[PDB]
Design an enzyme around this catalytic site. Structure first.
Site: not given
Ligand SMILES: Nc1nc2c(ncn2[C@@H]2O[C@H](COP(=O)(O)OP(=O)(O)OP(=O)(O)O)[C@@H](O)[C@H]2O)c(=O)[nH]1
Ligand SMILES: [Mg+2]
Ligand SMILES: Nc1nc2c(ncn2[C@@H]2O[C@H](COP(=O)(O)OP(=O)(O)OP(=O)(O)O)[C@@H](O)[C@H]2O)c(=O)[nH]1
Lengths: 427, 417
Positions: A11, A62, A170, A245
């Site tokens: 995400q 997802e 989260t 580089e």
């Molecule tokens: N920069 C940024 N960070 C985010 C964002 N949304 C969530 N995060 C960070 O990403 C962390 C969670 O990692 P994710 O990559 O969102 O987790 P995921 O992709 O849903 O992986 P799964 O939970 O296994 O489905 C959270 O603790 C947030 O701190 C966003 O929109 N921008």
């Molecule tokens: Mg996810």
């Protein structure tokens, strides 16, 4: 010619990529449909109909955020087979993303990168966007790293990783996934641009005066920094011309490939009446610890390399004057055996922001990439949290029940323990 | 993604009907299944608990005693449920665990499992099941455990959430129940991933000490249980980031498997944010009868509902974590998670919900333990089970496992960094 591929995992990676590609299109004048009314061809491939499409792979286990992409105003910009979804995620678990869920989707993903690459002739590598607290963003990112190194061993690779922060965190197992992904990925990467969410949150609260910065503001700012970093690849600059580089100028040793990135200045859109900050003022702001993407104290560490990337109406003589002013200081402490200079690449394209965001356009700006030993403490905090959990074997059953061995955690910890030593070794 | 609701027994059926009625009112779906609300947020994640064909609940209703059909069919939401989904037996269990687990559950379990299969195969992706049942009776407890075991062996990779009510003398004062409670808690420890341990004693205490009532009947108790169920599932029903689904919730909240029993809490009981934050942690607001200050929380999820400032709630949650830092274990960094949703529950403007995995739950089992000690050592009603294909060895092993659970909770309460 010279081509790059963008990879977005999870995400956080997908949303940062949304922001980054939106800003790229706004900078290059590419319409949302993709029709442009070419040094920038490195990040866009054109078709017979003149349609410029990004070389971007949006990956998720997802479909929610990817569907958000497909229903956005940039739906026709990306190709439908370049966006990959799934029915089951990892649920904040590196083991599920890497071992269980990742198996069913990594083959399809790699095939999609293969089709993307067969349209390329001069690939330097991939720009992988992901995070540390996510099960997808750690597990699948790690598996993709390993398989790409097996498949593209000659090719280079970079990360744009996201450092977890409690306010926007989260899951409670974020240090687990961070340590696991770092241990597995340290070998297959050339340069990682870690970004701390607490730093961005603080910048939005203080400089941008946003009471509750949600993810939109964070991704917008992160897109600003990422674009400022990649401008040299996209604007035909005089420094950092290719992905190799970067690691040549910023990563002088295998293990220590974690630069500290700084962006200046940051002015709220409501402060549009701001007078233009001079080159000296922004140059000084570069070294102020209140404007850094990763929370650390460069004053208390020893540098290894450093480079400036300017933008806008900037004159080289004033840049040289600012460099001379900064150099004659006791606050900058390089090592005693390395080039004690600043590889200064200067760009002249004006800085431009997203119309509608809380940032105001500034006629000139600057980014600072300094590989130093300060960022070492940014690692230690993570290990501390890890040391607080694995001692009690907290949450380890969730990992061990999805195809991971317990002792691996110890190994991973040991690895970053060794990493920490290297930081004191060079300092 | 979708969740297949299951309810068993009289208490399970009643609390499930209340849950469905309340969430249907919240989601704007009428009593005929059609949508008549006025928000986009209501339909963002409506497929989780409903089927479209008008919206049909994804529920299966089980009760050996056959009267509760009409009662369920007499409620404000009696016609929405799928008529095939009613799986009712002929004879009641008479508050015997072995009757509902070996001699009469074993006959209807096949049909209910087939109905469960039919409901599950119609979902593209399934999170898991939620069982609203009761640990004191012989239909909810024994049948519930049998179905949990069968589904877990049939769907090994599905999260099996459940809701359980532990009986109290102040509500029924029947003497055979703790045997059923012990035998059910055995299966809950062994074959479940998370559990919202509701206490009838706690509900009676809230109704009497606070609400200033004579606290009769099951209407008010089921009203409170429905409110808590709506609060706890608020995160899953509406779009959000904290505990987006059941597996993320279990990963966030449950360390140390077999230690997944939760203390719910709700406020207000039937108004500024600071008093909400203060009250939701208070002992006067726990549906599991205990003092949360008599134990140390392992994990906490706090869900706010309504219109409120985010900075204020963040500041107050930080303040509470700072003040009561004695009770939060120091070896789980950032163990308090916070979510804020915009939609308030029906009839309430500002609401707060709390789910805490805490060691205090141990004293609950100890309570039940002593009740078992009050009868098993006296050989009270032993042949009622031995004549129904039950052996004393299961009683002894259930007592041993519950005592071991108490020991585990005490050990993790006393541990330090
Ligand atoms: N920069 C940024 N960070 C985010 C964002 N949304 C969530 N995060 C960070 O990403 C962390 C969670 O990692 P994710 O990559 O969102 O987790 P995921 O992709 O849903 O992986 P799964 O939970 O296994 O489905 C959270 O603790 C947030 O701190 C966003 O929109 N921008
Ligand atoms: Mg996810
Ligand atoms: N709070 C509350 N408790 C209930 C309700 N219905 C039953 N109970 C509890 O359940 C206990 C009676 O056993 P049950 O678990 O209901 O057994 P059953 O569901 O009637 O099925 P059988 O075991 O066959 O009788 C009583 O001690 C009650 O405290 C209810 O609607 N609300």
């Amino acid at each position: 010619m010279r081509e790059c591929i963008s990879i977005h995992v999870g995400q956080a990676g997908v949303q940062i990529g949304n922001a980054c590609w939106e800003l790229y299109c706004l900078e290059h004048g590419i319409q949302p449909d993709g029709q442009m009314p070419d040094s920038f061809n490195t990040f866009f491939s054109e078709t017979g109909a003149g349609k410029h499409v990004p070389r971007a792979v949006f990956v998720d286990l997802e479909p929610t955020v990817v569907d958000e992409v497909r229903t956005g105003t940039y739906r026709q910009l990306f190709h439908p087979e370049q966006l990959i979804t799934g029915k089951e995620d990892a649920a904040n678990n590196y083991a599920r993303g890497h071992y269980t869920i990742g198996k069913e989707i990594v083959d399809l993903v790699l095939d999609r990168i293969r089709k993307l690459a067969d349209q390329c002739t001069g690939l330097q590598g991939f720009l992988i966007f992901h995070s540390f607290g996510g099960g997808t963003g750690s597990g699948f990112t790690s598996l993709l790293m390993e398989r790409l190194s097996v498949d593209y061993g000659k090719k280079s690779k970079l990360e744009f990783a996201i450092y977890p922060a409690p306010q926007v965190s989260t899951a409670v197992v974020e240090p687990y996934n961070s340590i696991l992904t770092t241990h597995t990925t340290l070998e297959h990467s050339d340069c990682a641009f870690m970004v701390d969410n607490e730093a961005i949150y603080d910048i939005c609260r203080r400089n941008l005066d946003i009471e509750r910065p949600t993810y939109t503001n964070l991704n917008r700012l992160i897109g600003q920094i990422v674009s400022s970093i990649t401008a040299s690849l996209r604007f035909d600059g005089a420094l950092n011309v290719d992905l190799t580089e970067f690691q040549t100028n910023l990563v002088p040793y295998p293990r220590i490939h974690f630069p500290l990135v700084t962006y200046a200045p940051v002015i709220s859109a409501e402060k549009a009446y701001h007078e233009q900050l001079s080159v000296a003022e922004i140059t000084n702001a570069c070294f102020e610890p209140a404007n850094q993407m990763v929370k650390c104290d460069p004053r208390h560490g020893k540098y290894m390399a450093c480079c400036m990337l300017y933008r806008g109406d900037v004159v080289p003589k004033d840049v040289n004057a600012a460099i001379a002013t900064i150099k004659t200081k006791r606050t900058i402490q390089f090592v005693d055996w390395c080039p004690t200079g600043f590889k200064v690449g200067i760009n002249y394209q004006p800085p431009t922001v997203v119309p509608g965001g809380d940032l105001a356009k500034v006629q000139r700006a600057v980014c600072m990439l300094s590989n130093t030993t300060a960022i070492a403490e940014a690692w230690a905090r993570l290990d501390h949290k890890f040391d607080l959990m694995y001692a009690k074997r907290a949450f380890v059953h969730w990992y061990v029940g999805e195809g991971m061995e317990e002792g691996e955690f110890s190994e991973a910890r040991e690895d970053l323990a060794a990493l920490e030593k290297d930081y004191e070794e060079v300092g | 993604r979708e969740i297949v609701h299951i309810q068993a027994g009289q208490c399970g059926n009643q609390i499930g009907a209340k849950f469905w009625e309340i969430i249907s009112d919240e989601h704007g779906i009428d009593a005929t299944g059609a949508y008549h609300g006025d928000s986009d947020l209501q339909l963002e994640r409506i497929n989780v608990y409903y089927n479209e064909a008008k919206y049909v609940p994804r529920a299966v209703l089980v009760d050996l005693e056959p009267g509760t059909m009409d009662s369920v069919r007499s409620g404000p939401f009696g016609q929405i449920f799928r008529p095939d989904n009613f799986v009712f037996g002929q004879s009641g269990a008479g508050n015997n665990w072995a009757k509902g687990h070996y001699t009469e559950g074993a006959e209807l379990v096949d049909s209910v499992l087939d109905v469960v299969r039919k409901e599950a195969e119609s979902c593209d992706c399934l999170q898991g099941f939620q069982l609203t049942h009761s640990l004191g009776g012989g239909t909810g407890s024994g049948m519930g455990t049998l179905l949990i075991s069968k589904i877990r062996e049939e769907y090994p990779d599905r999260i099996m959430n459940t809701y359980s009510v532990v009986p109290s003398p102040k509500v029924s004062d029947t003497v055979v129940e703790p045997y059923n409670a012990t035998l059910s808690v055995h299966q809950l420890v062994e074959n479940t991933d998370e559990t919202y341990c509701i206490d009838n004693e706690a509900l009676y205490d809230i109704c009497f000490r606070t609400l200033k009532l004579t606290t009769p009947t099951y209407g008010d108790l089921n009203h409170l249980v429905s409110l808590t169920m709506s609060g706890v599932t608020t995160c899953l029903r509406f779009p959000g980031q904290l505990n987006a689904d059941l597996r993320k919730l279990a990963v966030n909240m449950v360390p140390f498997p077999r230690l997944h029993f939760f203390m719910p809490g709700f406020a207000p009981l039937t108004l500024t944010v600071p008093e909400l934050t203060q009250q939701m942690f208070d002992a006067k607001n726990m549906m599991a009868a205990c003092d949360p200050r008599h134990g140390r929380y392992l994990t906490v999820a706090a869900i706010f509902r309504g219109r409120m400032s985010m900075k204020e709630v963040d500041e107050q949650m930080l303040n509470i974590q700072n003040k009561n830092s004695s009770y939060f274990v120091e070896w789980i960094p950032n163990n308090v998670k916070t979510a804020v949703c915009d939609i308030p529950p029906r009839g309430l403007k500002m609401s707060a919900t709390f789910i805490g995995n805490s060691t205090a739950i141990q004293e609950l089992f100890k309570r039940i333990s002593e009740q078992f000690t009050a009868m098993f050592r006296r050989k009270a009603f032993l042949h009622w089970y031995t004549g129904e294909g039950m052996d004393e060895m299961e009683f002894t092993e259930a007592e041993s496992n519950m005592n071991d659970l108490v020991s585990e909770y005490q050990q993790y309460q006393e541990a330090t960094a």
